[PDB]
Amino acid sequence: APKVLFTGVVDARGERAVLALGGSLAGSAAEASHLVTDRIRRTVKFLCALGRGIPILSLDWLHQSRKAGFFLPPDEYVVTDPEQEKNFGFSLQDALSRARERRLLEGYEIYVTPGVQPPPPQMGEIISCCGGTYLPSMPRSYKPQRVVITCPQDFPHCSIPLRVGLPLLSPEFLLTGVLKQEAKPEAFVLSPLE
C-alpha cells in the first residue's frame, strides 16, 4: 500500500483518495513511496523525494485511480514542468533515473555550520535522503568526500577544516546538486578570507 506525500499544493480530495484506496498519508519524504505535486520546486519534500528516486506524480494520478478503484501505475502521471526545467536547466526524468541508479551522496560526510541558510536540519534531511551522512559536529580530519557547508557568519569557526584541507562549500552545492542529481563540490568552494 502506498504512503503518499504532498508538497507545494493543497489537495484534500487527493488525500481522501489515498485513504479510500487503502494507502496512507506519509509523514515525510523519507517515509513516502510517492510524492504528489503540481510543479518542480526546490523544497525539502521535493528534493528528498527526488533524491530517493520515488515517483513524483501529478494530482491526476489519485483522481484517476479513485475512478479506477485501485492505484494506477505511475508512468502516465509523472510531473511535467518544462518551464521550471528551463529555469533550472535539468530534466526531472533524467534526474530521477540517476537517483534510481545510485544515491547521489553515497560516501559523502557533510557538516553544515550553524549559521547556514537554509537551516542545517533541513539540509541534513536532504543529505540523508540522498544517502549521505549529516555530521553531528565539525570534523577534525581529512577524508575524501568529507565537506563542510558553511557561510560568512561561520568563517571564524573554520580554522580546523581549513587546517586539514576539507572543502568549505556553499549551501547551493546541496540544493542545486540534489535538484540536478549531479554533485559538483569543486564548483561551490567559498572564499573565507574575502
Question: What domains sit in the chain, N to C, each tagged with a CATH number?
Answer: 1-100 (3.40.50.10190), 101-194 (3.40.50.10190)
Structural element, H or E, at residue 75: none
24 CB neighbour count, 10 Å cutoff: 14
Distance CA 96, CA 102 (A): 10
Method: X-ray
Please answer whether residues 115 and 153 qualify as being in contact, where contact means their C-beta atoms are separated by less than 8 angstroms.
Answer: yes
Please answer whether residues 46 and 7 qualify as being in contact, where contact means their C-beta atoms are separated by less than 8 angstroms.
Answer: yes
Comparing CA positions, the residue from 98, 111, 20 lying closest to residue 62 is: 20
Counted residue by residue, the chain has a size of 194
DSSP 117: S
- Left (φ > 0), alpha (ψ -120 to 50) or beta: where does 86 sit? alpha
C-alpha cell at 110: 557533510
Q: What is the resolution of this structure in A?
A: 1.5
- 34, 40, 44, 45 alpha-carbon torsion, rounded to 10°: -20
112 CB neighbour count, 10 Å cutoff: 25
Helix (H, G, I), strand (E, B) or coil at 49: helix
Distance CA 145, CA 193 (A): 23
Spell out the alpha helix ranges (H) of the chain. Answer: 12-20, 44-52, 60-68, 82-88, 92-101, 120-129, 159-164, 172-180
